[PDB]
Amino acid sequence: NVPELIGAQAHAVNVILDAETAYPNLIFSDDLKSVRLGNKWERLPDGPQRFDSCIFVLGSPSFLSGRRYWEVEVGDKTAWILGACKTSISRKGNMTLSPENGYWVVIMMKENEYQASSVPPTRLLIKEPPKRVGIFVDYRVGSISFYNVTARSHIYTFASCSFSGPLQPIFSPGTRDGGKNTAPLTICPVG
């Protein structure tokens, strides 16, 4: 039982970026709705709580109940990661992104190359590139679904996730890619 997009949207929540968790070269909008990768010398004040190797930032709030939906503009970017993760993940190191390791994400590897972070990863057959991606967590059921909002179509669902403890959003705007992927991810209101 995976919702149709319009169903999932009914559970729209208000996510903001936690800049203090963030990989040090990530740059943010004042409203903490947008994040982009800056230059090696554009840097946040350092702390032991930051990602050190993965270009990640976590969203707030964490949650451990209900149905939760949010949407992110990815636009014409060539690379990104979007989904949710256990609040307990380590931020030191490229831990492999997997349900087992507490990560449910979809990744754009490059133009025309998208995978769900199953293990092994599932190559998704995406016909219309999403300009906007929807994430829907049903905590009680143990499901997280990904939507192509642009096309109004379902991309992928992880089911029987058996969630325990709090989940939160996670985001990567990818590496710079010669200047073709400098655009940010932007958390957007439904509409």
From Swiss-Prot:
The entry's stated outcome for I6T is: In ARFMF; likely benign
Q: Please tell me in which tissues this protein is expressed.
A: Expressed in peripheral blood leukocytes, particularly in mature granulocytes and to a lesser extent in monocytes but not in lymphocytes. Detected in spleen, lung and muscle, probably as a result of leukocyte infiltration in these tissues. Not expressed in thymus, prostate, testis, ovary, small intestine, colon, heart, brain, placenta, liver, kidney, pancreas. Expression detected in several myeloid leukemic, colon cancer, and prostate cancer cell lines.
Tell me how the protein is altered or processed after translation.
Answer: Cleaved by CASP1. The N-terminal cleavage product localizes to the nucleus as a filamentous network and to the cytoplasm, interacts more strongly with RELA and NFKBIA than the full-length protein, enhances the nuclear localization of RELA and induces NFKBIA proteolysis. The C-terminal cleavage product localizes to the cytoplasm.
Regulation: induction:
In monocytes, up-regulated by treatment with colchicine and IFN-alpha, by the pro-inflammatory cytokines IFNG/IFN-gamma and TNF, by bacterial lipopolysaccharides (LPS) and by retroviral infection. Repressed in monocytes by the anti-inflammatory cytokines IL10/interleukin-10, TGFB1 and IL4/interleukin-4. In neutrophils and macrophages, up-regulated by IFNG/IFN-gamma with a peak after 8 hours of treatment.
The effect of A159S is: In ARFMF; uncertain significance
**Signal peptide residue numbers:** none
Residue ranges of every copy of the B30.2/SPRY domain listed in the record? 1-190
- State the oligomer form and interacting partners: Homotrimer. Interacts (via the B box-type zinc finger) with PSTPIP1. Interacts (via the B30.2/SPRY domain) with several components of the inflammasome complex, including CASP1 p20 and p10 subunits, CASP5, PYCARD, NLRP1, NLRP2 and NLRP3, as well as with unprocessed IL1B; this interaction may lead to autophagic degradation of these proteins. Component of the AIM2 PANoptosome complex, a multiprotein complex that drives inflammatory cell death (PANoptosis). Interacts with NFKBIA and RELA. Interacts weakly with VASP and ACTR3.
State what this protein does. Involved in the regulation of innate immunity and the inflammatory response in response to IFNG/IFN-gamma. Organizes autophagic machinery by serving as a platform for the assembly of ULK1, Beclin 1/BECN1, ATG16L1, and ATG8 family members and recognizes specific autophagy targets, thus coordinating target recognition with assembly of the autophagic apparatus and initiation of autophagy. Acts as an autophagy receptor for the degradation of several inflammasome components, including CASP1, NLRP1 and NLRP3, hence preventing excessive IL1B- and IL18-mediated inflammation.
- Which disorder is it connected to? Familial Mediterranean fever, autosomal recessive: A hereditary periodic fever syndrome characterized by recurrent episodic fever, serosal inflammation and pain in the abdomen, chest or joints. It is frequently complicated by reactive amyloidosis, which leads to renal failure and can be prophylactically treated with colchicine. Familial Mediterranean fever, autosomal dominant: A hereditary periodic fever syndrome characterized by periodic fever, serosal inflammation and pain in the abdomen, chest or joints as seen also in the autosomal recessive form of the disease. It is associated with reactive renal amyloidosis and characterized by colchicine unresponsiveness.
About its domains, the entry says: The B box-type zinc finger interacts, possibly intramolecularly, with the pyrin domain; this may be an autoinhibitory mechanism released by PSTPIP1 binding.
Query: What's this protein's name?
Result: Pyrin
Q: Which organism is it from?
A: Homo sapiens
Q: Which residues of the full protein are shown?
A: 586 to 776 of 781
